[PDB]
Amino acid sequence: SDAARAARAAALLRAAANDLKRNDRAAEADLGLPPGSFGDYVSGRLPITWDLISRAAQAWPLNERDLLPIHNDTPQGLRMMRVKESEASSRIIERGGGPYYEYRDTAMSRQASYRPEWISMLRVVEDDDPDNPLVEWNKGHLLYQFTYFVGPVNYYFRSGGRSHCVPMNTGDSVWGLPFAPHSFTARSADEPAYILALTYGGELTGDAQRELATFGRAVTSSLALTPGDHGAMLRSVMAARLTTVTELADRSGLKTDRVAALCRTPARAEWPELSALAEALGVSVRELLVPHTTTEADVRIQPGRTASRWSYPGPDAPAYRFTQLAGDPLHPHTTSLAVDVLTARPDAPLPPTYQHQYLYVLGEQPVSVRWRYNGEQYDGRLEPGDSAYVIPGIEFSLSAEKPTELLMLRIGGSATPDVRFALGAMPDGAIGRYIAEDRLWY
Amino acid sequence: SDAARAARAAALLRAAANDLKRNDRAAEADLGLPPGSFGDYVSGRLPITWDLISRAAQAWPLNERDLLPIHNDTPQGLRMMRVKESEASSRIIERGGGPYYEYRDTAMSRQASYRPEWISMLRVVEDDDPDNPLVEWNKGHLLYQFTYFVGPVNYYFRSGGRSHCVPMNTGDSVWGLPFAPHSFTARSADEPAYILALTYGGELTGDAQRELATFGRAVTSSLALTPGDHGAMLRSVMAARLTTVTELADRSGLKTDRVAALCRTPARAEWPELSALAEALGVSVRELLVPHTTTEADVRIQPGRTASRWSYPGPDAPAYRFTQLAGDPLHPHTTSLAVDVLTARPDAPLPPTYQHQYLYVLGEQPVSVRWRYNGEQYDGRLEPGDSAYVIPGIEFSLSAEKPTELLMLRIGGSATPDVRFALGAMPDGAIGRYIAEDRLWY
Numbered sequence: 001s002d003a004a005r006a007a008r009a010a011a012l013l014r015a016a017a018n019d020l021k022r023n024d025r026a027a028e029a030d031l032g033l034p035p036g037s038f039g040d041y042v043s044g045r046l047p048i049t050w051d052l053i054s055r056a057a058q059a060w061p062l063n064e065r066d067l068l069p070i071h072n073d074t075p076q077g078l079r080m081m082r083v084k085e086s087e088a089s090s091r092i093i094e095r096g097g098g099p100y101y102e103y104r105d106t107a108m109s110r111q112a113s114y115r116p117e118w119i120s121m122l123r124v125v126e127d128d129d130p131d132n133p134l135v136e137w138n139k140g141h142l143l144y145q146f147t148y149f150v151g152p153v154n155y156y157f158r159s160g161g162r163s164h165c166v167p168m169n170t171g172d173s174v175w176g177l178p179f180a181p182h183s184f185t186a187r188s189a190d191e192p193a194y195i196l197a198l199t200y201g202g203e204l205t206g207d208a209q210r211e212l213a214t215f216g217r218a219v220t221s222s223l224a225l226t227p228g229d230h231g232a233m234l235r236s237v238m239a240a241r242l243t244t245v246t247e248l249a250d251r252s253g254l255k256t257d258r259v260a261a262l263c264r265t266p267a268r269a270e271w272p273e274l275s276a277l278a279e280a281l282g283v284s285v286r287e288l289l290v291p292h293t294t295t296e297a298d299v300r301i302q303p304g305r306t307a308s309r310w311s312y313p314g315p316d317a318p319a320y321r322f323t324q325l326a327g328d329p330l331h332p333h334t335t336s337l338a339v340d341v342l343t344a345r346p347d348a349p350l351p352p353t354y355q356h357q358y359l360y361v362l363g364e365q366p367v368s369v370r371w372r373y374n375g376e377q378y379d380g381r382l383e384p385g386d387s388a389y390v391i392p393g394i395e396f397s398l399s400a401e402k403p404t405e406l407l408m409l410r411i412g413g414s415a416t417p418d419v420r421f422a423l424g425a426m427p428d429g430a431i432g433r434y435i436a437e438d439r440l441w442y
Numbered sequence: 443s444d445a446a447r448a449a450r451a452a453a454l455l456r457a458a459a460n461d462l463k464r465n466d467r468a469a470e471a472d473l474g475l476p477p478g479s480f481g482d483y484v485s486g487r488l489p490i491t492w493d494l495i496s497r498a499a500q501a502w503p504l505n506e507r508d509l510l511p512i513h514n515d516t517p518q519g520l521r522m523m524r525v526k527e528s529e530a531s532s533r534i535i536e537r538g539g540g541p542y543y544e545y546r547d548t549a550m551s552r553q554a555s556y557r558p559e560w561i562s563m564l565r566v567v568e569d570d571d572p573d574n575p576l577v578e579w580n581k582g583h584l585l586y587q588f589t590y591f592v593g594p595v596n597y598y599f600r601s602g603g604r605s606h607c608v609p610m611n612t613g614d615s616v617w618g619l620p621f622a623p624h625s626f627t628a629r630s631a632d633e634p635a636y637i638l639a640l641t642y643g644g645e646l647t648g649d650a651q652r653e654l655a656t657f658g659r660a661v662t663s664s665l666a667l668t669p670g671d672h673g674a675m676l677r678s679v680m681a682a683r684l685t686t687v688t689e690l691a692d693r694s695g696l697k698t699d700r701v702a703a704l705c706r707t708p709a710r711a712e713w714p715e716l717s718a719l720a721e722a723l724g725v726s727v728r729e730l731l732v733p734h735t736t737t738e739a740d741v742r743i744q745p746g747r748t749a750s751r752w753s754y755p756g757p758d759a760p761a762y763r764f765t766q767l768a769g770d771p772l773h774p775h776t777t778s779l780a781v782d783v784l785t786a787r788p789d790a791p792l793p794p795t796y797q798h799q800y801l802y803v804l805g806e807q808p809v810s811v812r813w814r815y816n817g818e819q820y821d822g823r824l825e826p827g828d829s830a831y832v833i834p835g836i837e838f839s840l841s842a843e844k845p846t847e848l849l850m851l852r853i854g855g856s857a858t859p860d861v862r863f864a865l866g867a868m869p870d871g872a873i874g875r876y877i878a879e880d881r882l883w884y
């Protein structure tokens with residue numbers, strides 16, 4: 001595992017040198033390495049130190065970040081975390097003079113952006129007033145949040161200077177935007193009241209944050225695009241091409257008056273207009289479409305009672321019953337589900353998805369999991385309160401001796417649609433070298 | 443600025459602790475630190491060391507990479523590189539027992555993915571045969587290639603086991619896919635023959651490579667999507683939502699047989715069908731559409747003589763004359779242009795774009811550049827053969843005392859459209875915190 005990570009780091013060093021058109025001799029000269037030695041660092045015979053990575057960021061126009069791999073802590077492609085481990089991670093935090101939350105980690109991975117916490121509400125309120133002084137608010141946090149409610153939990157949320165309180169119960173859920181302040185209390189001291197607060201990051205975190213942080217606040221603010229504003233998207237692509245209204249009109253076959261009008265409205269153009277504009281701009285129609293959001297006051301609440309329900313693979317012989325939980329079209333790759341596992345057999349493999357997956361066993365019976373990864377088959381059993389992390393691409397099935405429920409949150413990773421289409425365009429054999437460069441570029 | 447970068451690293455440390463719901467004392471417990479030291483690290487009283495970052499990656503489900511900022515090496519928003527500096531970076535490479543290429547760096551930044559080399563063709567051929575033994579091929583490299591030709595350069599390229607040669611002349615260009623093998627030679631020893639080989643990264647480099655490398659080649663290949671393949675895109679979203687053909691038909695109003703058939707073809711559904719399917723899947727129609735490509739043999743060649751040209755900002759105000767160079771809809775955010783600078787005054791500012799920009803002066807007269815960044819106005823001059831790098835969001839003008847030509851390559855950075863939608867959805871005032879977290883989460 002450490003040797004595999006070292007190999008990944010060595011491949012990144014060769015890739016960086018190849019990309020800078022530095023062959024072995026040129027890289028040794030730039031990095032102050034002994035003549036003839038570069039192959040020993042690229043092959044793994046010599047370790048790549050933080051000293052060398054720091055020297056490379058000074059000698060070359062790259063960052064220390066560009067030479068570091070990430071860790072693989074999910075070697076079987078799925079990993080379970082046990083209740084005992086979650087309880088050992090316990091943190092109690094006081095707010096307003098008394099204990100307010102108990103936090104427990106659930107299944108996480110260095111390969112994924114999940115930060116999923118079990119959190120019990122320790123503050124009990126006697127009304128649903130958002131301005132109740134017993135409520136201790138947070139400041140909001142960068143990560144998106146999907147929250148699943150168990151018991152009589154009150155959800156408090158703030159946006160544009162107004163505080164709201166929506167009472168929840170078991171099976172309700174909410175999806176929420178970055179930096180939206182919120183809080184949770186219990187309406188009763190008599191029954192369990194807790195949440196699965198499954199926060200996660202996506203594209204905002206990682207490379208985008210590092211880059212935008214160097215540009216500064218003004219440049220970053222100026223790159224923002226408001227959801228649903230198609231005219232702004234069109235203006236942005238026009239600016240990226242350095243085209244003009246009359247030139248785009250001439251190339252697309254649209255009237256100049258129409259192109260100007262489309263630049264000034266959030267409503268999308270008609271489909272034939274979008275196709276003509278896209279071709280004139282050298283982009284797919286995909287790039288002129290802007291997602292809408294369903295959020296209001298920066299959250300989208302899904303009542304469990306009215307949530308969509310369906311059976312898999314179908315009602316004639318159902319293995320699972322799914323309930324659709326809260327999400328948002330700003331994050332089309334986030335799927336949240338309550339899963340009733342009905343089958344006692346391993347006869348219903350779920351289709352592999354490009355998403356990361358997180359599982360948490362809500363029901364009273366254990367769930368047996370069977371999965372495949374890199375030519376091996378594995379099996380395991382999640383007890384109630386156990387959780388699991390699954391990398392993209394894994395085929396697994398679930399079963400239980402009696403019907404039982406689990407919570408499933410699936411999120412997009414860094415392999416976005418654009419990445420996946422780039423992978424699809426690569427010539428045969430190239431994906432291997434993309435994963436781990438193994439040679440000088442000539 | 444090392445001090446600013448150290449502050450960025452401190453902020454990432456606070457953010458990582460916030461995301462894991464570790465306050466100061468909890469973080470000190472997890473990391474084995476003495477009491478009070480975690481505040482010292484976040485505040486800057488103690489420097490953040492590789493030892494601390496390594497400890498964090500061992501104790502917490504994060505990567506060392508996640509705690510490192512990138513460098514700001516473009517403090518004025520635009521940075522020029524001079525002929526003398528490019529010449530100083532000269533590297534001569536032999537292939538087949540004699541000189542083949544001279545490489546020279548041009549403007550680059552730790553904030554962008556450009557790897558732009560000036561490259562002189564040192565191998566002279568007497569025919570255009572791709573199997574000529576004087577032609578020495580590379581193995582293909584990870585980065586995308588955008589190449590502008592000067593002089594009688596032969597371009598050689600391989601795809602699918604076949605080798606090709608297209609004789610180029612000044613003003614021709616080509617855009618090429620990752621790992622497509624290629625070469626360049628000169629048809630004459632008696633005139634300059636060289637290229638601007640403006641390689642760059644996109645979606646593939648950085649986070650996505652790091653994650654995919656830990657999943658392995660089998661999973662990574664399974665995630666590929668073929669450009670143009672709408673049925674694969676539909677199947678992907680269906681698998682992400684765990685909707686069968688029958689359930690998606692049920693929701694959308696399309697017949698079961700029609701949904702199944704749309705999953706078996708690259709051709710897109712009809713627009714009303716796409717609208718109904720997207721609504722049923724909780725996504726914008728954008729997520730059922732796919733990029734297409736125009737590449738043949740993995741490249742897209744643009745003859746200079748047939749390239750589209752237009753005046754900017756308009757026909758009746760031609761400050762500049764643009765020539766559209768080689769690109770592809772697989773990279774909608776890549777704009778390649780040859781720019782004839784016609785105005786002698788800085789009276790035609792180019793609108794700010796979300797793209798990074800790279801400039802190289804091709805013509806025989808200097809180009810004056812006036813730009814603004816962070817409330818300050820700057821003036822500079824690019825001599826023939828000088829280059830420049832520009833961060834996103836900069837407004838600049840170009841002027842010259844006589845018409846002169848500049849090569850421009852604009853590429854998308856890590857702030858993808860999805861990042862920009864997310865920035866637009868963020869509550870007002872939170873971009874400061876996104877750039878640099880400055881507080882405990884509660």
Ligand SMILES: [Fe+3]
Binds near residue numbers: 141145182197
């Ligand atoms: Fe939260």
Ligand SMILES: [Fe+3]
Binds near residue numbers: 583
């Ligand atoms: Fe190349």
